[PDB]
């Protein structure tokens, strides 16, 4: 058979590839003006009989999201007031204003020497800090400083710029496409039998949290557990719920915001008086939608692990507060909530609310890096936020006694997991339209 | 019957051009991550019988290298500490701790009050400074200031960044190529009888030095003397050796390094006490190798200069230390070594060593501008430098009587010469693939 | 029989478009050949106020302005309590209270030392901090830092040319009677615009394009009161401005390589800065403007040129830059007349500011260092900006006064001749084949 080589251009063939993606929007820290608005025109191929294999963990689309958002934070906070002029000693006392026992010693009235509009004169303010914002010196009772003045300068003001996790869509460049999985039980453990394509992904809200994943994409049918290696206790387990759990969080204190000028057009905002009494910040998870919901996580664990196995949910391991508590952003203010009332029960194979206490920090290390620090501004009045628990980040402990008592704890200080939990449906491929084939000519 | 104009596309034709070259590699100041790894394959196209004319001193490839090295320094020096808060009165005398005679007056023990993490606290800090870095204040007897506080701020700590001369490759953009000279005897001007082309040059180590060129390309066969105008005085004579001369430099003092904070994450490093007796820093140049090497240079000078001419080598002319001494970086430290024992002879018509004393300097301007300054952090312990003398930068004494006995002395005040010496082999050429020739059709 | 689709490539068709333009100067070098291409018989409808070249010029000039101030000394260390009295140097009656002799404590290269520095300031740059009227501060120390260094960098209006990017062209209108009242019947294609001098002004248009046949009036809506009227003259009016004070420029360091410049003692008697406008020329100029206003406003009536109404000094008086210092000159002698339907100079007194706020924004401040010796300016008034009063008794006797200090209105008078079009070379048409 004297057959002849030929070339076809426009052949629908994919290669795995790594490229950059466009930011597509739908001031603000995330959806900045340097992001492309797009038409409400999602497109797909009406899923055909294409089988593809892809996974999580090794998906570089996650790494691009992580690095790209750091680059927004590092620019959004540059044109703000440096708080270096406030790294002074403080004379602090207890606040004494109808404080509940649980908040005793939680607030400190501190009195400091601040610079002002003129360089040769100074003034004396009287602001309230949370105990977690301040570190003592000399084992004194009256000699305090801000917690991060002995590391990179604390920089933060810009109360006009929102931290709200407004969704961002990712779009591929021409010549590239994003594959989208439509399986209901998709995991990274092999191929996705039913796939389609998009040019742009759905929007992802860059919600910051460490133990409970908030305001994400809910599983369509069943609770699903995903991990890189379930056997290896060094890996995190990402659990996606198929039913949301409503969590109501608040800081029930009618705080007054005061403002002084530090320097040449450099404003500083500082909690300056508290109307009413002092109460502890807290979050409410209904027992009714938590005690049974957790049992679905357990039902799935029983398929990955042996059945007729006793498991336990324990509280977190401790260490840095940021990796021990449920860290999240509520209205621009940072919360560090205890999870001990959510992960205490044990399970065997054979309405009321859960109230958990919260503490608040203003001075935080926003990321795992320690070369930056920020003082979140105070918020006028009382803040309340309602959010959906979409999933959990769990750590399984190690060791083995009679192959039983598997203990799980909330944990994990890495935020890559917060995007792995939503970008699991997408892969980036390159199209190579030039194909070679045998024919007759 | 006549000839027609026809067009040929893909014609091997060259034109002179100047373009932007890519930085390619294989953190640092120079070998930064924002530089593209080269293709490991030495894809030369080999030699063909082409005789291209090219030269040195009119070559813009070197000028582009010069600009990039300076810009990279500014990028690395900018995002670091400022030492402005240290422009204070220093109270010091020549306090010694078994300092030898050769070092009398080289070190001063200065007490001053540095600022600290908090505005309301002060340091009492002792710092041992090299004499070249401080000056009398008001010409008093015991009042000193850092030498550069009356010019712009001195800006540097950040000891984590390396100043090691990791080689940089230059690569042309598509449509361009670099013509490489394989003539072992090639001068800095005229045709190169043997030309091969490359897409990327070999790596060139951005070693910054003055009168003795260190760690560069060695001549393949013979000592080669290259100059823009060999009979002038306004041009430098750049001499490439065909044998390395081994040089070993050291600061035999076990220095302790201490640090304080100046401000909010603003670290400063300084020399503390020194363990052991204090000895002068020095360089050891093998005597036999140096004497044979210089004799080779003299014989080659006689091929450009006249016959039966006594050639003599004098020391440098003086003026700024930066253009009088052998100045080089080693481990991040800056040496300024004398060359008096290298250039002290007359050449007739027909395990010994040379010891060169050194005076170490901490605050430098580094280039040929005085609008900035940087402080080199000290290095803990004893430092030992091993390097190859590859070439010399010489200057001729202008003025003579009856054309006899020309005198040469070290030059090399400019930095461009350090790179001219290694880019003599390359030209940038634009390829013009579209050509026209007559034919029949 | 029937017609068959033919594709043509290289078809000369234009579409309205917005793109970036290349900024060229004497930015990239300007091509010495304008490459004007044959005036052609097309009619092109375009206008001002709906144009994009003006907005782009505004953004470009701001960026360039800031780039020249970024690498300069901040004066923040000098925002200290000042103490002062009046200057006593045969001060004329018109300069009483205009200068103050103030002392302050300046920093030095070394943290440890101070300088006792005396300098003179113009009154408009100083604010009373109360606590006894002998404790005043610089006017912008309660906003962002005031920047000053780089006396070597000029404020001169070096011409800028706008050049089309590939795929685009700039159309140029050569209609000598051109206005926004309809299309331009005389259009040429150019590669680059002529150079436009970026002269800063809030009232009179200095050193711009001149009308060639007659005085003409352009406005977005000439019958509204909410829009400004840009009047272009065809006969430049000479204006001569001066500050007849033999000054001293001194320099001190306030930090490590940080120089600060200030006004030292003034030699000679202190006199007020002023501008001279030829009276007869100004009278003829206004008469022509009036003849043109009567074509848009009811004719056979009386109209008036009135004083500005008030606001910040920047927009109430005539602000301009000359020499390297800023002037805020009163124009009361230029706009004080009515017109009836039937060697001798005008002296305009001036005020001076050293600390300047910019183009209707308050996020910065800059200090202009003083010039040594006596400064004199000569310039061409090529246009005038008018604002129409918001109604009148019996809807008659129209009155106009100075206003329109926004920077965009100055470039609208230079970029009115140009439009940016995208080239769409691909077109379809029908042929037999």
């Amino acid at each position: 058979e004297n057959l002849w080589v030929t070339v076809y251009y426009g052949v629908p063939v994919w290669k795995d590839a790594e490229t950059t993606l466009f930011c597509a929007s739908d001031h603000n820290v995330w959806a900045t003006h340097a992001c492309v608005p797009t038409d409400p025109n999602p497109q797909e191929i009406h899923l055909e009989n294409v089988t593809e294999e892809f996974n999580m963990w090794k998906n570089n689309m996650v790494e691009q999201m992580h690095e790209d958002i750091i680059s927004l934070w590092d620019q959004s906070l540059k044109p703000c007031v440096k708080l270096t002029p406030l790294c002074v000693t403080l004379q602090c006392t207890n606040v004494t204003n109808n404080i509940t026992d649980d908040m005793r010693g939680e607030l400190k009235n501190c009195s400091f020497n601040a610079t002002t509009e003129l360089r040769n004169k100074r003034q004396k303010v009287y602001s309230l800090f949370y105990r977690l914002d301040i570190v003592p010196m000399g084992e004194n009772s009256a000699n305090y400083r801000l917690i991060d003045c002995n590391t990179s300068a604390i920089t933060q003001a810009c109360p006009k710029v929102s931290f709200e996790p407004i969704p961002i869509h990712y779009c591929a460049p021409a010549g590239f496409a994003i594959l989208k999985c439509k399986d209901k039980k998709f995991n990274g453990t092999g191929p996705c039998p039913s796939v389609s394509t998009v040019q742009c992904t759905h929007g992802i809200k860059p919600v910051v949290s460490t133990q409970l994943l908030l305001n994400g994409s809910l599983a369509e049918e069943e609770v699903i557990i995903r991990s890189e290696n379930i056997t290896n206790n060094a890996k995190n387990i990402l659990v996606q719920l198929n039913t949301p759990v409503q969590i109501n969080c608040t800081r029930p204190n009618n705080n007054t915001v005061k403002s002084i000028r530090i320097g040449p057009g450099q404003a500083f905002y500082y909690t300056g008086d508290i109307i009413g009494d002092i109460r502890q910040a807290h979050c409410n998870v209904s027992k009714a939608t938590w005690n049974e919901t957790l049992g679905k996580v357990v039902k799935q664990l029983r398929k990955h692990f042996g059945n007729n196995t006793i498991i336990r949910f324990a509280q977190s391991s401790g260490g840095d507060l940021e990796v021990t508590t449920h860290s999240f952003n509520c209205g621009g203010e940072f919360f560090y909530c205890n999870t001990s009332g959510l992960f205490n029960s044990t399970w065997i194979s054979n309405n009321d609310s859960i109230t958990l206490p919260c503490r608040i920090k203003q001075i935080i290390n926003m990321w795992q890096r320690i070369g930056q620090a920020m003082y979140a501004p105070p918020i006028q009045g009382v803040i309340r936020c309602v959010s959906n628990i979409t999933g959990l980040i769990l750590t399984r402990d190690g060791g083995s006694t009679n192959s039983t008592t598997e203990t799980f704890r909330p944990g994990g200080g890495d935020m890559r997991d917060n995007w792995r939990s939503e970008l699991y449906k997408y892969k980036v491929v390159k199209i190579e339209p030039l194909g070679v084939a045998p024919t007759r000519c | 019957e006549n000839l027609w104009v026809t067009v040929y596309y893909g014609v091997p034709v060259w034109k002179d051009a100047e373009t932007t070259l890519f930085c390619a590699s294989d953190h640092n100041v120079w070998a930064t991550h924002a530089c593209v790894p080269t293709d490991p394959n030495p894809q030369e196209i080999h030699l063909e019988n082409v005789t291209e004319e090219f030269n040195m001193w009119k070559n813009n490839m070197v000028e582009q290298m010069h600009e990039d090295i300076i810009s990279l320094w500014d990028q690395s020096l900018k995002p670091c500490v400022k030492l402005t808060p240290l422009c204070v009165t220093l109270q010091c005398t020549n306090v010694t701790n078994n300092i030898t005679d050769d070092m009398r007056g080289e070190l001063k023990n200065c007490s001053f009050n540095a600022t600290t993490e908090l505005r309301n606290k002060r340091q009492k800090v002792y710092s041992l400074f090299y004499r070249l870095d401080i000056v009398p204040m008001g010409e008093n007897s015991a009042n000193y200031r850092l030498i550069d506080c009356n010019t712009s701020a001195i800006t540097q700590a950040c000891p984590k960044v390396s100043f090691e001369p990791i080689p940089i490759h230059y690569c042309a953009p598509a449509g361009f190529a670099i013509l490489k000279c394989k003539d072992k005897k090639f001068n800095g001007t005229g045709p190169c009888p043997s030309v091969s082309t490359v897409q990327c040059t070999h790596g060139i180590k951005p070693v910054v030095s003055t009168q003795l060129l260190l760690n560069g390309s060695l001549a393949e066969e013979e000592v080669i003397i290259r100059s823009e105008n060999i009979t002038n005085n306004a041009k430098n004579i750049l001499v490439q050796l065909n044998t390395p001369v081994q040089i070993n430099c050291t600061r035999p003092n076990n220095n302790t390094v201490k640090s304080i904070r100046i401000g909010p994450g603003q670290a400063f490093y300084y020399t503390g006490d020194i363990i052991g007796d204090i000895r002068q820093a020095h360089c050891n140049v093998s005597k036999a190798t140096w004497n044979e090497t210089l004799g080779k240079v003299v014989k080659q000078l006689r091929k450009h200069f006249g016959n039966n001419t006594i050639i003599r080598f004098a020391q440098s002319s003086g003026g700024d230390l930066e253009v009088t001494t052998h100045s080089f970086n080693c481990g991040g430290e800056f040496f300024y070594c004398n060359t008096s024992g290298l250039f002290n002879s007359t050449w007739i018509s027909n395990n010994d060593s040379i010891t060169l004393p050194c005076r170490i300097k901490q605050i430098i301007n580094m280039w040929q501008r005085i609008g900035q300054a940087m402080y080199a952090p000290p290095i803990q312990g004893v430092i030992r430098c091993v390097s190859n003398i590859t070439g010399l930068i010489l200057t001729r004494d202008g003025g003579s009587t009856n054309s006899t006995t020309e005198t040469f002395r070290p030059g090399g005040g400019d930095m461009r010469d350090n790179w001219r010496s290694e880019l003599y082999k390359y030209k940038v050429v634009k390829i013009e693939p579209l050509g026209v020739a007559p034919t029949r059709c | 029989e029937n017609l068959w689709v033919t594709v043509y490539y290289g078809v000369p068709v234009w579409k309205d478009a917005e793109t970036t333009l290349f900024c060229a100067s004497d930015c990239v070098p300007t091509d010495p050949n304008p490459q004007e291409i044959h005036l052609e018989n097309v009619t092109e409808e375009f206008n001002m106020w709906k144009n994009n070249m003006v907005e782009q010029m505004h953004e470009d000039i701001i960026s360039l302005w800031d780039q020249s101030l970024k690498p300069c000394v901040k004066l923040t260390p000098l925002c200290v309590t000042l103490q002062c009295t009046n200057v006593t140097n045969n001060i004329t009656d018109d300069m009483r209270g205009e200068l103050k002799n103030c002392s302050f404590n300046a920093t030095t290269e070394l943290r440890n030392k101070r300088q006792k520095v005396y300098s003179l300031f113009y009154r408009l740059d100083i604010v009373p901090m109360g606590e006894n009227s002998a404790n005043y501060r610089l006017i912008d120390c309660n906003t962002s830092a005031i920047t000053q260094a780089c006396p070597k960098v000029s404020f001169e209006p070096i011409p800028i040319h706008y050049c089309a990017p590939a795929g685009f062209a700039i159309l140029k209108c050569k209609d000598k009677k051109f206005n926004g009242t309809g299309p331009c019947p005389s259009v040429s294609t150019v590669q680059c615009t002529h150079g436009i001098k970026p002269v800063v002004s809030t009232q009179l248009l200095l050193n711009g394009s001149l009308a060639e046949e007659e005085v003409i009036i352009r406005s977005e809506n000439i019958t509204n009161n909410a829009k400004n009227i840009l009047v272009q003259l065809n006969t430049p009016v000479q204006i001569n401005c001066t500050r007849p004070n033999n000054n001293t420029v001194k320099s001190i360091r306030i930090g490590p390589g940080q120089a600060f410049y200030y006004t030292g003692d003034i030699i000679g008697d202190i006199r007020q800065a002023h501008c001279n406008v030829s009276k007869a020329t100004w009278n003829e100029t206004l008469g022509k403007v009036v003849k043109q206003l009567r074509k848009h406003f009811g004719n056979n009536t009386i109209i008036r040129f009135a004083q500005s109404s008030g606001g910040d000094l920047e927009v109430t008086t005539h602000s301009f830059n000359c020499g390297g210092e800023f002037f805020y000159c009163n124009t009361s002698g230029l706009f004080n007349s009515t017109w009836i339907s039937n060697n001798d100079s005008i002296t305009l007194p001036c005020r001076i500011k050293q600390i300047i706020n910019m183009w209707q924004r308050i996020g910065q401040a800059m200090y202009a260092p003083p010039i040594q010796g006596v400064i004199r300016c000569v310039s061409n008034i090529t246009g005038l900006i008018l604002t129409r009063d918001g109604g009148s008794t019996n809807s008659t006797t129209e009155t106009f006064r100075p206003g329109g200090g926004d920077m965009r209105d100055n470039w609208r008078s230079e970029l009115y001749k140009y439009k940016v079009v995208k080239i769409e070379p691909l077109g379809v048409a029908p042929t037999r084949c």
Epitope: R122, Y126 | N113, R119 | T76, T81, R111, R114, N132
Partner: antibody, heavy 132, light 106 residues
């Protein structure tokens, strides 16, 4: 002008009341805590009482002979003080002075704060009398 | 209320002599709360020294003080005619209880 305004003059009877007042601009309440001192002819100085400025609270301390019905107050608008007197006693036959002081700082830098001049000036009135 | 009893009460020295003044109290207050004033006859008093050793502005260098528990002192190294005044010791222990006053005569 570092001079307190004097007031509180006039004729009263012991079987009545008297209100004294004082103070001035410059040495304003935002920078000062103020007090009253009295002196009978032939006697030394006696402290009457002191009132703190707005910021730190304003709690007023008094000397025993003037407690309860001879109080001190702070205006907070025109920077003036008042001293209320009632049912005058023979020990009240004294000159009543208005007095306070300002600690003034003038820093040479907006960075370190140990390179600063310092001034501590007290200002006194001339004193009024109580016609017991 | 700290009780002060100025020991000299009646000091008499020619101009040019050292007027050593002394005051004493049984109550213990830190030396920070020691203050001396100078009262010219017919005039309101003025503060010389506060905080035992710290000096008020407008005061000659000849004026210096010290003190601790009960024994507090003021030194005027050389009297000038302008210094013949009654001096007062003040113990600012939350109450400015003054001593009786020490007259310095010729």
């Amino acid at each position: 002008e570092v001079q307190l305004v004097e007031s509180g003059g006039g004729l009263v009877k012991p079987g009545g009341s008297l209100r004294l007042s004082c103070a001035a601009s410059g040495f304003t309440f935002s920078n000062a805590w103020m007090s009253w001192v009295r002196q009978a002819p032939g006697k030394g100085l006696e402290w009457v009482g002191r009132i703190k400025s707005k910021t730190d609270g304003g709690t007023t301390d008094y000397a025993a002979p003037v407690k309860g019905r001879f109080t001190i107050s702070r205006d907070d608008s025109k920077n003036t003080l008042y001293l209320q007197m009632n049912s005058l006693k023979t020990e009240d036959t004294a000159v009543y002075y208005c007095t306070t002081g300002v600690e003034t700082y003038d820093f040479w830098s907006g960075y370190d704060d140990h390179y600063y001049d310092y001034y501590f000036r007290d200002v006194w009135g001339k004193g009024t009398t109580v016609t017991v | 209320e700290i009780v002060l009893t100025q020991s000299p009460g009646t000091l008499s020295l020619s101009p040019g002599e050292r007027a050593t003044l002394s005051c004493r109290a049984s109550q213990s207050v830190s030396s920070s709360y020691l203050a001396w004033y100078q009262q010219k006859p017919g005039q309101a008093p003025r503060l010389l020294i506060y905080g035992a050793s710290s000096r008020a502005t407008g005061i000659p260098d000849r004026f210096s003080g010290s003190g601790s528990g009960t024994d507090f002192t003021l030194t005027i190294s050389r009297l000038e005619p302008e210094d013949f005044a009654v001096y007062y010791c003040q113990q600012y222990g939350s109450s400015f209880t003054f001593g009786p006053g020490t007259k310095v005569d010729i």
